[PDB]
Design a protein around this ligand. Structure first.
Ligand SMILES: NS(=O)(=O)/N=C1\NCc2ccccc2N1
Ligand SMILES: [Zn+2]
Length: 257
């Protein structure tokens, strides 16, 4: 099955998922000089005050923090979006070394990690129906650089020891995702895809310009997770990122001058 190794990684995915070579694949390099300010773009509305986290899961590719998405509890609106998108989960991609790990790049620069907050368009009723639609999903992407610790990340870091291997999960209620955001909501946006199989072309990407800083100790704990299941040979969960894909017939828009 698919993964991030030499024998099952991003260069192999197209054999099972031919859309891997499609017209709106993600991630992409964000060329900051070619991206154009769009004054028609609205401010992003990130409404996470009533978010209800459920659980954290090691799925063998990353770890996901899952949320209750049965009502409009944590939603994303505005910006390039029409209507309302409900938060279903977040996860990260990260590297084996601080100089790599992000999926999007900015003028070819790679960050140490990238946070993805995944949301689905409520007009389609459920996530499964949303991923059959060209405007089904909105993913808020946030870069991580290594510097001072991010206090709102520490609760995530301190539970990772309990989900070391694939298939393990733990209760993760009462987590506030507002603690993962930077100060500014300035962003770039473009139409793209899921960055993991099945690579579906359903996503409005919203990538924040301002990174968050996390400490070396925080990102080191990410790197102690395992891709494998319990009792199997240990393979550290590192370098779980897809590289930038061809931009093709797309334009990246900026919310800021
Ligand atoms: N890295 S990503 O673009 O959020 N990719 C994702 N997100 C959410 C998801 C749910 C189910 C199956 C695959 C994926 N892939
Ligand atoms: Zn992701």
């Amino acid at each position: 099955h698919w993964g991030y190794g030499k024998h099952n990684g991003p260069e192999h995915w197209h054999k099972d998922f031919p859309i891997a070579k499609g017209e709106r694949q993600s991630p992409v390099d964000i060329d900051t000089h070619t991206a154009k300010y769009d004054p028609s773009l609205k401010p992003l509305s990130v409404s996470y005050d009533q978010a209800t986290s459920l659980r954290i899961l090691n799925n063998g590719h990353a770890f996901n923090v899952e949320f209750d998405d049965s009502q409009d509890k944590a939603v994303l609106k505005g910006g390039p979006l029409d209507g309302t998108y409900r938060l279903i989960q977040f996860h990260f991609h990260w590297g084996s070394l601080d100089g790599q790990g992000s999926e999007h790049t900015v003028d070819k620069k790679k960050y140490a990690a990238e946070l993805h907050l995944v949301h689905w368009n409520t007009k389609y009723g459920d996530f499964g129906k949303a991923v059959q639609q060209p405007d089904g999903l909105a993913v808020l992407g946030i870069f991580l650089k290594v510097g001072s610790a991010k206090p709102g990340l520490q609760k995530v870091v301190d539970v990772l020891d309990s989900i070391k291997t694939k298939g393990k999960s733990a209760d993760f209620t009462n987590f506030d995702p507002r603690g993962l955001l930077p100060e500014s909501l300035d962003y770039w946006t473009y139409p793209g895809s899921l960055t993991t199989p099945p690579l579906l072309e359903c996503v409005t990407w919203i990538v924040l310009k301002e990174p968050i800083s996390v400490s070396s100790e925080q990102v080191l704990k990410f790197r102690k997770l395992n891709f494998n299941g319990e009792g199997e040979p240990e393979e550290l969960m590192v370098d779980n990122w897809r590289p930038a894909q061809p931009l093709k017939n797309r334009q990246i828009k900026a919310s800021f001058k």
